[PDB]
Design a protein around this nucleic acid. Structure first.
Ligand SMILES: [Mg+2]
Ligand SMILES: [Mg+2]
Ligand SMILES: [Mg+2]
Ligand SMILES: [Mg+2]
Ligand SMILES: [Mg+2]
Ligand SMILES: [Mg+2]
Ligand SMILES: [Mg+2]
Ligand SMILES: [Mg+2]
Ligand SMILES: [Mg+2]
Lengths: 83, 114, 99, 100, 127, 152
RNA sequence: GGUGGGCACUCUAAGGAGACUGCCGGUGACAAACCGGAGGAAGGUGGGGAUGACGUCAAGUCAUCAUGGCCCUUACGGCCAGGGCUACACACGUGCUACAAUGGUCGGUACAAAGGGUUGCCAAGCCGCGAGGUGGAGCUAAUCCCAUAAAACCGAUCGUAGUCCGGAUCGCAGUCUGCAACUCGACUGCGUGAAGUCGGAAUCGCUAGUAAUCGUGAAUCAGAAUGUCACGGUGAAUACGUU
């Protein structure tokens, strides 16, 4: 895990796109390519479509998984099954 | 006697058994309520066994440990997280090899078709 | 009382330079104590020789650095300072201290 | 070892060398304990907005003659195999085959 | 007075001084027993001295550097043998027959390319 | 080999007892280059033998060795059509090594506290011949006797 | 060796002597040469390394490089962000750790070689269980740092029990570099604690400082070695012989 000298980590464009989304409530999913972003507790309730590699998978965030990275919930390997 | 602690052994050696205390925190408990580590637990007066019970009950052991581990694991599968998703398959979650040599988390060989 | 250090890749040239500086310093009357061979520095390299997969075919190469130390007593004439082109020619490095 | 690969890694070299101090300043700000979150967050934003292709971790040193990434000896500037040619020709000073 | 000797064995070196005295036997400014702890070093060291029945007549002061405990013991043995034969130059044949003057020459063989140790090799599956 | 040029380096490094056979037993019992451990194990077994038997352990060890040294052994031979075993007498030198190897191998697997009393028990057993090593030596001998039809 | 000092010794590195069947006995076609002995530190090309003949396998490499052709020109040429090469019902090769008492822990204690360091090493004190943090000395290095070798010895304990063995897996919280450790790094603290009782057919390495076993360093490199290359400590057994 990241050293505690830097708690959060969000790309600046993502911040300025979601810091707008706090004054006005959740109204539209945010299309995101940054998988390294750390979700802060004060954006709970929004829908974020994270880039899988082909399409953007949308996810909803609540307080339970605040301590996790964005792309952690978006897998990239299919594995439909050997048989 | 805790939860059926063994006798005829050194205090800390038997104190490793309470399922939540190893050897370091076991020695910490032994030195907190000062008793001889080299003394056999059989020759231990009951006037300190109650203090050892207090020390054990301070943090956790057996049942509470089961509860906490299982609740922690349960909030992983439901969340849709990658760690829980792999934890739902028997595959290792830290990121070891899977092309081969993932045996401790797949049990027997279970050969193809037979 | 000055101290002189000599570095070279090849021992023959450093020996020639040490003899030259000893002769120049002694011939003017200034006293000189004998040279000190400092331990050499050997660096080794193991390199693959095939353009493609042959792991056991390898070459070993070595670079050797030789160091010599000199010191003088009773400094009266300093001509070797102006004889730098004489002292060093192509591959010997000379350092001087406590002039 | 294309021409484009050499040109575009020269790009990394140029960009990294051109700043060469602002990274040190921002890392001094961050690493210093008594800096306060007020003077740490602005440094974080400064580091983030600065172009990504100006970092030491973004540089891969290649042969100065062909640009082969693997088989590099930083004692020289040469690749795995041109070292052998130069040594055999006798261009590398002080280098001989060793047995010991 | 005194006599000097040098002994080397397996990258270990030892300087020995043999003087008139009662055999104080100091190893690196320490007693012989206090240096070698529960091993065969003591008697193999004293072997040349006990063979010439002159254990105490010669005080021995040595310094040993490099190698290991067995190598140091061998170096001391060779050095004191040299020091003795620098005093009694009629027992040369005695220590030839004893085999104490000939220096050991075996040294740690180097590692080679394609091998793990000096001579060990990988398994070489035939397929 | 094919030359018969290999030398025979002589090792005799008994520290205090000054015994030759003891030295070869040391070399046999030593494992992974641990000479000191072998010294302590063998000397503990020897001291147990002393504190048990009033006889000096030197001769007890010697008579145990001489009661486990075989005289003939069976060796396979490729006749070119059958699997045959022929009895051959032991070389005078080889029997000592055979006895040492058998003794140490059988002593390694007692299951009691340590090899001190393990080797002590084996030396006492083979002093008069109630040990498993002597039994297996007799079994080898009876192989050789039951295959005497070849002999040669 | 802290200082004066010494050129005694070790040590460092340059130049040199020494081993050439040289001498003796025996054999041998009184040849070549063979078997012992003296002296000798070393005796029979002393030990190790580099050195690979004419050619073979249309062996490998067009992806290190060069190069005769053939191929694309809005792309089979370029730029950027994410993902993969680290996937997983299985099989194979090469290693590491084990299955313990020739050992696991605890306390104090002894001896090596080799090497790297000024876009570097990075000490002292102090703060943290720890990984680590402030701090800045000294060093362009036989001077300062990396950095305290381990196995070994002694004393206490464990008593053969899947165990004071073994450590995978897993849960929680950390530390370091890097813009960024989810896919996908290495280490740290607590806890759980698995398979594993020496392994079939078959199969591998090794002739003396060798096998076995214990530790140390370098390269690549912001970080990432159970791999590669290199250095020492302890230290064996066996060779009747050529079917
Ligand atoms: Mg090109
Ligand atoms: Mg890189
Ligand atoms: Mg060497
Ligand atoms: Mg080794
Ligand atoms: Mg095979
Ligand atoms: Mg072909
Ligand atoms: Mg091909
Ligand atoms: Mg791959
Ligand atoms: Mg051979």
């Amino acid at each position: 895990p990241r050293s505690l000298k830097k708690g959060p980590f969000i790309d600046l464009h993502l911040l300025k796109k979601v810091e707008v989304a706090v004054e006005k409530n959740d109204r539209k999913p945010i299309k995101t390519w940054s998988r390294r972003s750390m979700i802060l507790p004060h954006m709970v309730g929004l829908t974020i479509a994270v880039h899988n590699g082909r399409q953007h998978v949308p996810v909803l965030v609540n307080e339970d998984m605040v301590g996790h990275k964005l792309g952690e919930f978006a897998a990239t390997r299919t594995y439909r099954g050997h048989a | 006697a805790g939860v059926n602690i063994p006798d005829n052994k050194h205090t800390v050696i038997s104190l490793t058994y309470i399922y939540g205390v190893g050897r370091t925190t076991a020695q910490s408990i032994c030195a907190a309520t000062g008793v001889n580590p080299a003394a056999k637990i059989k020759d231990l007066s009951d006037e300190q066994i109650d203090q050892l019970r207090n020390e054990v009950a301070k943090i956790t052991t057996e049942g509470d440990l089961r509860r906490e581990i299982n609740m922690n694991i349960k909030r992983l599968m439901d969340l849709g997280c990658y760690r829980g998703l792999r934890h739902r398959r028997g595959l290792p979650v830290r990121g070891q090899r899977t092309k081969t040599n993932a045996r401790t988390r797949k049990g027997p060989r279970k050969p193809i078709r037979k | 009382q000055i101290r002189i250090r000599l570095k070279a890749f090849d021992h023959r040239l450093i020996d020639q330079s040490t003899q030259e500086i000893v002769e120049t310093a002694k011939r003017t009357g200034a006293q000189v104590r004998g040279p000190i061979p400092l331990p050499t520095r050997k660096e080794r390299f193991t390199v693959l020789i095939s353009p493609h997969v042959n792991k056991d075919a390898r070459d070993q190469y070595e670079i050797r650095t030789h160091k010599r130390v000199l010191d003088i007593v009773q400094p009266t004439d300093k001509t070797v300072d102006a004889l730098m082109k004489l002292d060093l020619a192509a591959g010997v490095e000379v350092q001087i201290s406590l002039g | 070892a294309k021409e484009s690969m050499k040109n575009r890694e020269l790009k990394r070299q140029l960009t990294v060398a051109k700043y060469a101090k602002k990274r040190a300043e921002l890392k001094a700000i961050i690493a210093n304990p008594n800096s306060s979150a007020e003077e740490r967050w602005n440094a974080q934003v400064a580091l983030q907005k600065q172009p990504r292709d100006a970092s030491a971790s973004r540089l891969r040193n290649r042969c100065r003659l062909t640009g082969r990434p693997h088989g590099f000896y930083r004692k020289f500037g040469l690749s795995r195999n041109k070292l052998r040619e130069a040594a055999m020709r006798g261009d590398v000073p002080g280098l001989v085959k060793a047995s010991w | 007075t005194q006599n000097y000797g040098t002994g080397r064995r397996k990258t270990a070196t030892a300087r020995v001084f043999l003087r008139p005295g009662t055999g104080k036997i100091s190893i690196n400014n320490r007693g012989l027993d206090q240096f070698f702890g529960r091993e065969t070093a003591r008697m193999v060291v004293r072997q040349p001295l006990e063979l010439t029945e002159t254990v105490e007549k010669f005080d021995i002061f040595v310094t040993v550097v490099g190698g290991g405990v067995s190598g140091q013991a061998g170096a001391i043995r060779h050095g004191i043998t040299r020091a003795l034969i620098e005093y009694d130059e009629t027992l040369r044949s005695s220590l030839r027959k004893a085999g104490y003057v000939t220096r050991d020459a075996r040294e740690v063989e180097r590692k080679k390319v394609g091998l793990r140790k000096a001579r060990k090799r990988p398994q070489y599956s035939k397929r | 080999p094919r030359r018969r040029v290999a030398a025979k380096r002589e090792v005799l490094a008994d520290p205090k007892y000054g015994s030759q056979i003891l030295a070869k037993f040391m070399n046999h019992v030593m494992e992974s280059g641990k000479k000191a451990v072998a010294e302590r194990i063998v000397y503990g077994a020897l001291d147990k033998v002393k504190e048990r038997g009033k006889a000096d352990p030197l001769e007890t060890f010697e008579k145990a060795l001489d009661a486990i040294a075989p005289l003939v052994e069976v060796k396979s031979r490729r006749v070119g059509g059958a699997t045959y075993q022929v009895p051959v007498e032991v070389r005078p030198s080889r029997r000592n090594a055979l006895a040492m190897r058998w003794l140490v191998d059988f002593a390694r697997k007692r299951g009691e506290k340590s090899m001190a009393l393990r080797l002590a028990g084996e030396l006492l057993d083979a002093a008069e011949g109630k040990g498993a090593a002597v039994k297996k030596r007799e079994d080898v001998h009876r192989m050789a006797e039951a295959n005497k039809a070849f002999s040669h």
